[PDB]
Structure 1
Amino acid sequence: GAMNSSNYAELFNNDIKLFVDDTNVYRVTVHKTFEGNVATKAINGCIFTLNPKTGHLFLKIIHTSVWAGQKRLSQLAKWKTAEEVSALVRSLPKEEQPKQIIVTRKAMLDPLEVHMLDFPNIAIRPTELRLPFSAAMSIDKLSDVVMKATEPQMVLFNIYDDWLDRISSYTAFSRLTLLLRALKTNEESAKMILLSDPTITIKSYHLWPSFTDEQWITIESQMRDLILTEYGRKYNV
């Protein structure tokens, strides 16, 4: 069924599973036309497919050419997402295929179920968690590869860098969701926190800075302070 706080440790067991977030698949800017009407211009998007145990991220870049001449794009985007996730599963060796796919938005359930009819033993599940994966495009190296793409492309990342050498996947996912929630709530301040100290850098092969264990504690506290600060600003608390 649906995945929630009661069964949260299930994310870090040994059954292969993937989260799929479609928020950033169909992205547009809205603008006025010469005649004073309104029109949209699409920009490149991405499917965010993540194994929360290992940190492996399958970032399928959705190039704007896939929308050319198509109608009802917000609906199509869900079905294109499901088509691409299905294609990914089929591309993986059998022993790497997921036993569960958890979609972050319930509107993806039917499109994904229909595309996965050939896999009756892969469970397609919603979640009651509010996960901040829409903020993936606030990670500079991910946004850069999406915006530079000139054609459809799949790029593979480890969204946890090397953290699993020192922490569990439960703690790594908690760190990731805190960072992403902070970037979603106040992107400029979050990036300031992450880069303020020039002596801590991002390795060429990493997405996040090379913080020591003690520095991660400080950073995590600063991210929590940001989120709470923004909540007080929002609600006048």
Structure 2
Amino acid sequence: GAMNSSNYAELFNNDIKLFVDDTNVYRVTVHKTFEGNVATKAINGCIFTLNPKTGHLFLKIIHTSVWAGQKRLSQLAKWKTAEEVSALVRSLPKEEQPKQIIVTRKAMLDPLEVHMLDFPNIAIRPTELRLPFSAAMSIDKLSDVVMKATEPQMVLFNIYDDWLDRISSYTAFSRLTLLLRALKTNEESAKMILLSDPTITIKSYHLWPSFTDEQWITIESQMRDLILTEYGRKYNV
């Protein structure tokens, strides 16, 4: 079924589940030709597949060569996402395979169901949660690895760094979606908030800065303020 907020805590029960976001798989720049026309140029993208309980992010880099000589690329991108997610599931030991895959866009449902026919016990479902995973490419280390890739590649991250040493999965997911919503709403100001203090660094093996508990409370407040400020600017409130 469709996921949401009555059962927001269920995301963090012990049934393995993966979110799949395909909004950065097919990416283009739009530029004007010599004749005067406008033309797209594809740039590398990625599939964002996240376990919300553990923070494990399976980042499949989609190299622009996969689009060469193909038609209807927006449509193909969904089937390519579905192909790669099915391949990921098949590559995992049975005890690590998800019980549910939650797609952030309903248009992924049929491609994924068709590619997952070998796994009839894996539920494929949409969600009514609006999630800001399209802002994943605002995370500098993720954007860097996608843009530097010269071939298809899978890269594993923990998108929660070491937070689960100190907070619950529920709290970590809430922190992540707040950060990502802020990056989506006002990327340059959200990066200023995170990077304004040169004495708080990002560990070589992390994605986010090494904030103390109290610093995270302050950061989270500043991100909430950013989001509310932008709402007011947008709707003249």
Which TM-score tier does this pair reach, normalised by the shorter chain? over 0.9
**Deviation of 1:159 (Å):** 0.1
* 2:187 maps to 1:184: no
Question: What is the deviation of 1:37?
Answer: 1.0
The alpha-carbon deviation at position 80 of structure 1 amounts to: 0.1
Say which is worse superposed, 4-13 or 75-84, in terms of deviation. 4-13
1:156-195 paired onto structure 2 within 5 Å: 156-195=156-195
Q: Take 2:72 and 2:34, find their aligned partners in 1: how far apart are those partners?
A: 24
| 1:53-109 CA distance string (max 9 Å, x none) | 000000000000000000000000000000000000000000000000000000000
Aligned to 1:76, the other structure's residue is in SS state helix
Q: Please give the root-mean-square deviation of Cα atoms over the aligned residues, in Å.
A: 0.3
- Which ranges in structure 1 are unaligned for 5 or more consecutive residues? none
1:21 CA displacement: 0.1
How far did 1:214 drift?
Answer: 0.2
d(CA) in 2 for partners of 1:193 and 1:32? 35
**Following TM superposition, by how much is the alpha carbon of 1:18 offset from its aligned partner in structure 2, in angstroms?**
0.1
Gapped regions of structure 2 (runs ≥ 5): none
| Matches of 1:60 and 1:122, distance apart in 2 | 20
Describe the SS at the equivalent of 1:95. helix
Q: What is the Cα deviation at residue 213 of structure 1?
A: 0.2
Residue 30 of structure 1: CA displacement? 0.8
Show CA shifts across 1:104-138 (max 9, x none). 00000000000000100000010000000000000
Aligned counterparts of 2:10 and 2:70: Cα–Cα separation in 1: 39
Output the CA distance in 2 between the equivalents of 1:6 and 1:144: 37
Task: For residue 32 of structure 1, report the CA deviation from its aligned partner.
Answer: 1.0
Separation in structure 1 between the aligned mates of residue 144 and residue 59 of structure 2, nearest angstrom: 12
- Report the Cα distance in structure 1 between the residues aligned to 2:24 and 2:5, rounded to whole angstroms: 25
Show CA shifts across 1:150-178 (max 9, x none): 00000000000000000000000000000
In structure 2, the residue corresponding to 1:175 is in which secondary structure? helix
What secondary structure does 1:230 align onto? helix
Residue 209 of structure 1: how far off its partner (Å): 0.1
Structure 2: distance between partners of 1:177 and 1:154: 23
Cα distance between partner residues in 2 of 1:6 and 1:217: 25
Q: CA deviation at 1:6?
A: 1.1
Structure 1 segments, 4+ long, off by >3 Å, are none
1:82 counterpart SS class: helix
Please say which of residues 28-37 and 81-90 is displaced more in the overlay: 28-37
Q: 1:121 and 1:182 mapped to 2: Cα distance?
A: 36
- 1:38: how far off? 1.3
TM-score when normalising by structure 2 = 1.00
In the alignment, which residue of structure 2 is the partner of 1:104?
104
Greater shift, 28-37 or 85-94, is seen at: 28-37
Compute the displacement of 1:29 (Å).
Answer: 0.5
| Cα shift at 1:220 | 0.1
**How many angstroms does 1:31 deviate by?**
1.0
- Report the CA distance between 1:187 and its aligned residue: 0.2
Shift in Å, 1:141: 0.1
Offset from partner CA, 1:8-51 (integer Å, 9 cap, x none): 11110000000000000000011111111111000000000000
Work out the CA distance in 2 between the residues paired with 1:198 and 1:190.
Answer: 15
Identity of aligned residues (%): 100
TM-score by length of 1: 1.00
CA offset digits 1:177-200 (Å, max 9, x no partner): 000000000000000000111110
